[PDB]
Amino acid sequence: KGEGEVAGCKAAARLGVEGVFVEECFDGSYCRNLERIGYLRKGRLEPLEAAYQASRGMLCMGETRGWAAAVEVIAGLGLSLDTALVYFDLRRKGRKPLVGVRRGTLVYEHGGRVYEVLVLSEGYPLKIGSLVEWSRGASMDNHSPIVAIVDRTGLITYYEARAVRSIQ
């Protein structure tokens, strides 16, 4: 090309068929932090974290930046927008989630407690029984069950939803 736009990027990455690969680290302590926390390993950056870092303006995907880069990553790897928005929100709060084993979930650990977050979206109904069974399964794995409801405009609301035999 002419000139590559690197200024204002803390790292640069490429999108490949199944992942984001970090090609340049312009701020060493930035990438070392992503490595320390577990999201970056040998150039491979977790998909949701790559989308998040792009949304912050710290990760450049080639010459694509900001939320435009975030979208490239979400669309490119087939991430759910609402799961990404909850993920970003949790990261903004200082939490460090991972993709959970159960479909549609994020898990993060805070204060020696593990939280399992089920991401629900307006316009996509679910069975009350499925909510009970999911909550039971989370509790059975020693996770606090949190539901994150994203409305049709992107407003996020969190509740703890605990399955029990008797009110208490």
Which residues of this chain interact with other proteins, rule CB under 8 A? Answer: 66-68, 71-72, 74-76, 80-82, 85, 89-90, 93, 95, 108, 110, 115, 117, 120-129, 131-132, 135, 146-147, 149-155, 157-168
In the complex, what is the shortest distance from the CB of residue 158 to other proteins, in angstroms, rounded to a whole number? 4
Cβ of residue 108: shortest distance to other proteins, in angstroms? 8
Query: Nearer to other proteins by C-beta: 40 or 71?
Result: 71
Q: Minimal CA–CA distance to 21: which of 10, 30, 11, 9?
A: 11
Give the span between the Cα atoms of 137 and 31, in whole angstroms: 35
Between residues 31 and 53, which has the closer beta carbon with respect to other proteins? 53
Neighbours of 13 (CB within 10 A): 26
SS3 of residue 20 by DSSP: strand
Give the nearest distance from C-beta 22 to other proteins in angstroms: 21
Beta strand pairing call for 105-110 and 98-99: antiparallel
Cβ closer to other proteins: 46 or 76? 76
**How far is residue 119's CA from residue 101's CA, in Å, rounded to a whole number?**
13
Nearest to other proteins of 29, 166 (CB atom): 166
Query: Which residues have a Cβ under 8 Å from the Cβ of 139 and sit 6 or more positions away?
Result: 145, 162, 163
Strands 144-150 and 11-16, by their bridges, are unpaired
Amino acid code (one letter) for 29: S
- Residue 26 vs 158, nearer CB to other proteins: 158
CB of 72 to other proteins, least distance (A): 6
